[PDB]
């Protein structure tokens, strides 16, 4: 469904994606240990920290 970024995260290469606090996104998957998640926003796709996002509308 839809998630929202809790904090700002700036992309650092290695297929990561920058996300802004309050920005909505779709979660497409997770890495082996669940620490990183594949996100899709209006800016594209890339990995973002899993603990930086939460479901839109708690």
């Amino acid at each position: 469904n839809l998630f929202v970024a809790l904090y700002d995260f700036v992309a650092s290469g290695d297929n990561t994606l920058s996300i802004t606090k309050g920005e909505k996104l779709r979660v497409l998957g997770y890495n082996h240990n669940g620490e990183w998640c594949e996100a899709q926003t209006k800016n594209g796709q890339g990995w973002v920290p899993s603990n930086y996002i939460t479901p839109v509308n708690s």
């Binding site: 809790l6 904090y7 700002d8 995260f9 650092s12 290695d14 297929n15 990561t16 890495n31 082996h32 620490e35 990183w36 594949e38 990995w47 973002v48 920290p49 899993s50 603990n51 930086y52």
Partner: peptide
């Protein structure tokens, strides 16, 4: 996915 650790919450 990155092999390094995601930064902790600010």
């Amino acid at each position: 996915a990155p092999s390094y650790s995601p930064p902790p919450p600010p």
